[PDB]
Design a protein around this ligand. Structure first.
Ligand SMILES: CC(C)(COP(=O)(O)OP(=O)(O)OC[C@H]1O[C@@H](n2cnc3c(N)ncnc32)[C@H](O)[C@@H]1OP(=O)(O)O)[C@@H](O)C(=O)NCCC(=O)NCCSC(=O)CCC(=O)O
Ligand SMILES: CC(C)(COP(=O)(O)OP(=O)(O)OC[C@H]1O[C@@H](n2cnc3c(N)ncnc32)[C@H](O)[C@@H]1OP(=O)(O)O)[C@@H](O)C(=O)NCCC(=O)NCCSC(=O)CCC(=O)O
Ligand SMILES: CC(C)(COP(=O)(O)OP(=O)(O)OC[C@H]1O[C@@H](n2cnc3c(N)ncnc32)[C@H](O)[C@@H]1OP(=O)(O)O)[C@@H](O)C(=O)NCCC(=O)NCCSC(=O)CCC(=O)O
Ligand SMILES: CC(C)(COP(=O)(O)OP(=O)(O)OC[C@H]1O[C@@H](n2cnc3c(N)ncnc32)[C@H](O)[C@@H]1OP(=O)(O)O)[C@@H](O)C(=O)NCCC(=O)NCCSC(=O)CCC(=O)O
Ligand code: SF4
Ligand code: SF4
Ligand code: SF4
Ligand code: SF4
Lengths: 329, 329, 329, 329
């Protein structure tokens, strides 16, 4: 149980919603006079007025540094190559770590099983959560999500942030009397590594699994920078709607290392009709659903032409007198 | 240690070359009067003349059946939708299982640690090996590979078989005093599941690992049916040349299940200059080599922007006053 | 009016159906005892028995030659690297040119506007038509198309031929009392060059136009080797269903020149419900239809964000005080 | 000769460099105290101080409006969804049109063959040129291009602008005694429509042509957001180096209309060694050069497997006794 997995569980156990921290972010947004649009500058003004922290734009930082905070002189340097939404995210992260320290500490104190390292990692996680809840204040963002029928591009345009940030925030809308579609958010790379798992409730991939090549999230790299959608059926009959898309980090140069990821958002099929991404698709036809699994070794399907491995709790039929398109019959 | 892994190791231990069986395949090829070009027809005639086995092309077989052998009437039914190279492969598989039974049994008897099921899986594996060594007789195939500078498409065209079959056979050219480029052959899917591992000698991915998203094999699906090439450097400094390409199964219909795989062939950089795939590429410039790993949890690189997980034997450094492009620095 | 365009018109004027030639191909198929499956061998037998023509498989031909017929000794050589469907196509083409010469001549004689070169080009075109009508005899192919709901992959599997050949034959099903879906067939390359136009009746792209980047046929290369589908609306309100897919020629080698094409098949929206490719799509929602054009200079749309050129018969609004996402407002 | 072509030629005749206007942009940049990094803010302040123009960021503008200028109250509204580089570009466009009116008029007066509409289009073109020359002052941009070895991503990162803007400016570095690599810049879509042509000197595609599917610019869409590179040889023996990449407009929503374009930059092969994009590529091997053309009807190659149409000044050779891989041999 490594610390990043420990924090994964910390968030999964709390339905991916932190009521104290989300309320605090929204309260501060409103009390400060914030207005959506160009939050980076207003957050600079807020750090100055409320914390004596001076926010500067630094093209002198090392290439890989997004921000650096000097607590001795209270100076926050932010990378020039970050877009305004990204600058705002960095500034609000530091704002959480400086001005919401005690709240974060008390939230961490509620899971006493946490490893020594897991507590620091959770501090950073709650700081990122605060930044998301501030850039995307709960009520305004929820109403915008409903009005826009969950169009992630349009939400990003309205709030001045990227795709991954929007999907993050969508998977946290579990406030008691104002809930959005319950989502599972995942992040993957070209090799099937799932870097991030967040979920409003229990989904198949909340903690483990997801190495099924028929799952559309892995097809996002085959269709780069375009939204892919799938009506999927798990081996147990439960049906889900999946949207996914690639995200690439600009800059770095032709030679340099590049960041390529795929962000995917899934929900119960019953909710799909509320998404713009359901437009043009029939949702009431179980014949049109794509049968996927969780990874071949833990998948009990018997007629899958794509099986890479045999099912673990399964009987290996070996026939010298037959050959089929169905590996590991 | 599941049986398919036991057979993976069985072949790995023999440098992916089976001298008795390969010599037997070539002996039978030449003694029977075989000539490359239309092996399917000649193999049918051979089964008749030498084993009393009647080969029919049966469009009445189930959709997913490639072949079926009835030993009571010695009837081999072969799917009509298989190309001639594929039909030849099926017929030669049955030829190995019927006319080379004892040789295969004695070869299996040499790895006595094999589980009961692993022996059956090994019989199927050795029959496939024999089919490959028969359709592609060793000396003729080796001379053609050198003449064609390892152009896999041109080899397939010359011998009437597909990409995966050619790569299979290329990774087996370890006959003493007539060796080809030592290769590692792998097969993967969109989810990074590595279905096949065969290797002439010790490579990093001969048995485990290979979930590095910077590795070109996983970039094959973004460029389907197009050959991708990479000069890669493992974290230990050793450099390799990798060629890869996707392979899709035709038919099945728009709705039906589809087979999508990616086949990759790797060798030491020192051999790359003998490949047609090196044309246009500089091989002597360590600056141009792509730093890849074997999977993030077992990768010790320190400045990778693509890290999905932290390195296992390392402490997760967490800094509240900085944010970087380098996850898990 | 160049000769290939002249033959384009020759076929367009005849509703892409040649009743005499199609009936002759089917009549000969049936009288000869032909059975679907492995037509290449049976056509060899037919050339021998009926025309004294000897069909041989020649790996000695130049790389680019699919067949060569020596009339002095009546010998037809066919390339070894052609699949059986392709071999059958070559053999039946020569069969049309040798055994249906007078019929072809009389069909050509019906369009007396033909240029000197256009008559020879039309001879080859009618020979290809005969080959298609023979490999795919009309009644059997029509019934298979209806039973399979026009699944091009499954039709290819059943009849042992490729995607482009199937789409060719589908666009010719205009026999008076046994018509299939009326189609427009097109072939394009990565640069928008439309090499082939065939159509059962008058469609927008039967003769000219088709340089609209929003048209899905040009998106086939972005999604290689996978079927793409679109519900499109022309500027005049008429709605069409478009299926398209790439096709690549095997062999040639890593260095050599490659053939990449996209084949597209379109029909009136009203017919889409009879296609398997309509599965999962709502067809009764004009809101979900993609507005395309015929090429920007002849497209009268006013709010297209993708306009590359202004509409020819249009008023150029030029405003120094505004900038928009809509080029050439 | 439509007006947009007239302006294309207007710029082509001046080697895509406007000395007075470029010097004016740089003069104003330096005299005003401008420093690269946050030009949007400084340009707003400059419009205030120097022209009494009040710049507001207006989230109330219509969805498709990038800017709108009200001269009666001297109010410049700029779209909230534009990144800072884009906002700076809009503001500098208006700055050219308001504060450089007479210079632009006198520059337009030098091509007196211009149609009435061509003069307005040329005014917009010269304003865009000025905006490019201001956001990217000539000397600083030239020094940065050489230092960065023409890495377009790194230039964009350094100056806070996108790919298309950098390529625009790179193709204008023809100031006497301080020249950059002479470039041809083109913009195309999925249908091969070439929306933009700018060129430092005489290139094949400076005015017409470019519909060759083997040309790498059209392969950009198959690999979106990834840089593609090609060493190409025209039929006349002259060899060029081509870099290309797609550019997509964010937002707009899943349903809405999308802008997809491909931008390409070409130079003589002799200059390629100065590009970062040449790293790993051999430049002195004529065997490895890809033979491309300018469009099949104006391409005289004789063994091209990709020909879509026959060569215009040639007779279509038709052989009834042969079939080949070479259409229109
Ligand atoms: C996972 C890592 C370590 C990786 O960091 P990266 O360098 O890849 O990127 P990043 O810093 O997360 O930022 C990437 C994008 O995500 C956005 N973003 C990040 N966290 C967000 C949040 N909580 N809410 C909203 N948006 C958020 C940022 O704005 C940014 O957008 P832009 O790019 O547009 O600017 C980090 O995210 C992190 O430390 N998170 C907090 C700790 C945590 O939650 N760990 C559990 C992860 S779950 C896990 O690891 C389990 C997986 C498993 O099963 O093994
Ligand atoms: C792996 C399976 C079980 C599944 O195979 P599939 O049904 O998906 O396909 P396939 O039968 O292998 O056929 C696909 C193509 O491979 C070709 N092919 C297959 N074996 C070949 C060989 N030995 N030599 C040459 N070509 C060969 C066939 O001609 C065919 O070509 P066409 O496509 O053109 O028709 C099978 O291949 C098999 O039983 N192999 C023998 C058992 C074995 O060796 N297992 C160890 C694998 S190593 C492993 O799985 C462990 C790896 C790990 O644990 O990480
Ligand atoms: C167009 C050319 C010149 C190009 O030949 P290519 O080398 O590109 O390929 P090809 O010989 O046509 O064969 C390619 C595939 O098409 C199939 N195929 C070809 N003709 C067929 C037909 N009539 N019916 C069924 N299938 C057919 C072959 O089986 C083959 O399948 P496999 O690959 O799987 O084996 C040729 O097709 C031709 O000469 N056709 C006859 C003359 C004609 O009709 N000209 C008008 C074309 S329309 C036009 O040019 C107008 C465009 C415009 O607007 O300017
Ligand atoms: C071509 C049009 C009409 C259409 O343009 P669009 O609306 O599609 O986009 P856009 O306005 O050009 O802006 C897209 C990106 O290009 C950048 N950009 C535009 N002009 C630039 C310049 N001169 N220097 C540097 N960057 C420039 C913008 O910053 C912007 O960056 P971001 O995307 O990051 O925001 C327009 O560009 C224009 O009016 N140009 C001036 C008229 C002109 O020169 N016409 C001749 C073109 S030659 C032609 O069309 C004929 C070719 C032929 O006939 O074959
Ligand atoms: S066996 Fe299960 S997990 Fe594996 S590919 Fe098939 S459906 Fe997916
Ligand atoms: S950390 Fe290692 S395994 Fe992971 S992406 Fe980077 S190089 Fe590959
Ligand atoms: S203007 Fe017409 S032809 Fe051009 S992209 Fe738009 S819809 Fe297509
Ligand atoms: S004929 Fe010329 S223009 Fe056409 S694809 Fe070949 S090289 Fe390109």
């Amino acid at each position: 149980p490594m610390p990043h997995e420990e924090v994964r569980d910390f968030f999964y156990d709390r339905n991916n919603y932190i009521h104290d921290l989300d309320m605090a972010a929204e309260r501060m947004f409103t009390e400060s006079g914030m207005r959506t649009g160009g939050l980076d500058i207003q957050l600079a003004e807020l750090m100055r007025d409320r914390f004596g922290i001076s926010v500067v734009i630094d093209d002198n930082l090392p290439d890989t540094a997004k921000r650096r905070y000097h607590p001795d002189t209270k100076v926050l340097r932010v990378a020039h190559w970050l877009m305004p939404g990204q600058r705002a995210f960095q500034i609000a992260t530091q704002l959480a770590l400086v001005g919401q320290s005690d709240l974060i500490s008390s939230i961490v104190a509620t899971d006493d099983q946490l490893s020594t390292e897991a507590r620091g990692v959770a501090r950073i996680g709650l700081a990122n959560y605060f930044a998301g809840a501030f850039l995307l204040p709960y009520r305004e963002f929820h109403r915008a999500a409903e009005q826009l029928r969950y169009d992630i591009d349009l939400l990003g345009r309205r709030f001045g942030v990227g795709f991954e940030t929007v999907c993050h925030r969508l998977s946290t809308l579990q406030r008691p009397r104002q809930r959005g579609i319950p989502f599972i958010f995942v992040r993957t790379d070209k090799a099937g590594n799932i870097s991030k798992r967040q979920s409003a409730t229990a989904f198949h991939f909340s903690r483990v699994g997801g190495s099924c090549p028929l799952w559309v999230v892995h097809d996002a790299f085959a269709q780069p920078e375009r939204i892919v959608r799938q009506v999927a059926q798990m081996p147990d009959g439960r049906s889900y709607f999946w949207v996914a898309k690639t995200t690439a980090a600009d800059g770095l140069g032709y030679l340099g290392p590049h960041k390529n990821f795929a962000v995917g958002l899934g929900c119960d099929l019953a909710h799909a009709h509320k998404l713009v991404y359901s437009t043009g698709v029939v949702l009431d036809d179980p014949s049109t659903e794509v049968p996927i699994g969780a990874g071949c070794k833990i998948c009990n399907r018997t007629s899958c032409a794509q099986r890479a491995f045999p099912y673990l709790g399964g009987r290996v039929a070996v026939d010298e007198n037959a050959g089929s398109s169905l590996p590991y019959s």
